């Protein structure tokens, strides 16, 4: 149902902020973060990719220099695939 | 390193010229929005108490324009050793011709480097204030449309009085 976010644009940015904030943690198990890993991809699609550039900002700051990471890489790959189907 | 930088005889004039250019630009911007004249500036009537010349203020009144016109110039002198004047120099405060000279291929890079140095200094100040988060290389358009005016004003103010500081498929 999340298609058509054209009226309010800072609150989607804040939710995009907090999911990448608590995507990682030392007090977090894999069975507890699997639902965030399945959550942020369904957030990253069914959305307009214009203001998700403000969080692929911090996608490139820490993850692709690093060889938590797999979910972000899969999200990036699927977002790039959907974009193919500043930012450049 | 801006506080541990050398200050030449041209910096004492360039800081005053940058303060005068900032005051003239601010007065010209306040003259278009129907500003009032008052002793203290308030948000009710939009009073202007700082609509005066640069040489007509005192030490307590130049405290908001002394160090901010000196730290950026010290950072530019520390990034590139260029302290010289080799060209001519160029209430109702009238701003001068700021759109006379276009930016050259080295001058645009110097303005970009001054914006990057100012953004890094602002980020270090914000990190020190948080300890006691935005890069300009991958900034958005909403920040690039707002941060470029300070770099353009600093370049247009440094270009006067002869103080011109001089320094995706193919790659794949």
From Swiss-Prot, chain B:
The N-terminus is blocked. Sequence repeats lie at residues 1-90, 91-167. It is found in: Sarcoplasmic reticulum membrane. It comes from Oryctolagus cuniculus (Rabbit). The chain holds residues 2741 to 2939 of 5037 of the full protein. Binding of [3H]ryanodine indicates that the heterozygous channel is activated by Ca(2+) concentrations 4-fold lower than normal. Single-cell analysis of cotransfected cells shows a significantly increased resting cytoplasmic Ca(2+) level and a significantly reduced luminal Ca(2+) level. Homotetramer. Can also form heterotetramers with RYR2. Identified in a complex composed of RYR1, PDE4D, PKA, FKBP1A and protein phosphatase 1 (PP1). Repeated very high-level exercise decreases interaction with PDE4D and protein phosphatase 1 (PP1). Interacts with CALM; CALM with bound calcium inhibits the RYR1 channel activity. Interacts with S100A1. Interacts with FKBP1A; this stabilizes the closed conformation of the channel. Interacts with CACNA1S; interaction with CACNA1S is important for activation of the RYR1 channel. Interacts with CACNB1. Disulfide bonds: none annotated. Belongs to the ryanodine receptor (TC 1.A.3.1) family. RYR1 subfamily. It comes from the Eukaryota. This is Ryanodine receptor 1. Cytosolic calcium-activated calcium channel that mediates the release of Ca(2+) from the sarcoplasmic reticulum into the cytosol and thereby plays a key role in triggering muscle contraction following depolarization of T-tubules. Repeated very high-level exercise increases the open probability of the channel and leads to Ca(2+) leaking into the cytoplasm. Can also mediate the release of Ca(2+) from intracellular stores in neurons, and may thereby promote prolonged Ca(2+) signaling in the brain. Required for normal embryonic development of muscle fibers and skeletal muscle. The calcium release channel activity resides in the C-terminal region while the remaining part of the protein constitutes the 'foot' structure spanning the junctional gap between the sarcoplasmic reticulum (SR) and the T-tubule. Pore opening is mediated via the cytoplasmic calcium-binding domains that mediate a small rotation of the channel-forming transmembrane regions that then leads to channel opening. Detected in skeletal muscle (at protein level). Fast- or slow-twitch skeletal muscle.
């Amino acid at each position: 149902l999340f298609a058509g976010t054209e009226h309010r644009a800072i609150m989607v940015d804040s939710m995009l902020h907090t999911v990448y904030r608590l995507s990682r943690g030392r007090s977090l198990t894999k069975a507890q973060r699997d639902v965030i890993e399945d959550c942020l991809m369904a957030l990253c699609r069914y959305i307009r990719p214009s203001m998700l550039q403000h969080l692929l900002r911090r996608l490139v700051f820490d993850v692709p220099i690093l060889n938590x990471x797999x979910x972000x890489x899969x999200x990036x790959x699927x977002x790039x695939x959907x974009x193919x189907x500043x930012x450049x | 390193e801006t506080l541990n930088v050398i200050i030449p005889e041209k910096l004492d004039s360039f800081i005053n010229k940058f303060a005068e250019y900032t005051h003239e630009k601010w007065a010209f911007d306040k003259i278009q929005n129907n500003w009032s004249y008052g002793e203290n500036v308030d948000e009710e009537l939009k009073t202007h108490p700082m609509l005066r010349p640069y040489k007509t203020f005192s030490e307590k009144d130049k405290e908001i324009y002394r160090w901010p016109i000196k730290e950026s110039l010290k950072a530019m002198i520390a990034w590139e050793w260029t302290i010289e004047k080799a060209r001519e120099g160029e209430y109702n405060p009238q701003p001068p011709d700021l759109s006379g000279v276009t930016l050259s291929r080295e001058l645009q890079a110097m303005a970009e480097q001054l914006a990057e140095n100012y953004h890094n200094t602002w980020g270090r100040k914000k990190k020190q204030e948080l300890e006691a988060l935005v890069p300009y290389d991958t900034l958005t358009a909403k920040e690039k449309a707002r941060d470029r005016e300070k770099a353009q004003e600093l370049l247009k103010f440094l270009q006067m009085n002869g103080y011109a500081v001089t320094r995706x498929x193919x790659x794949x």
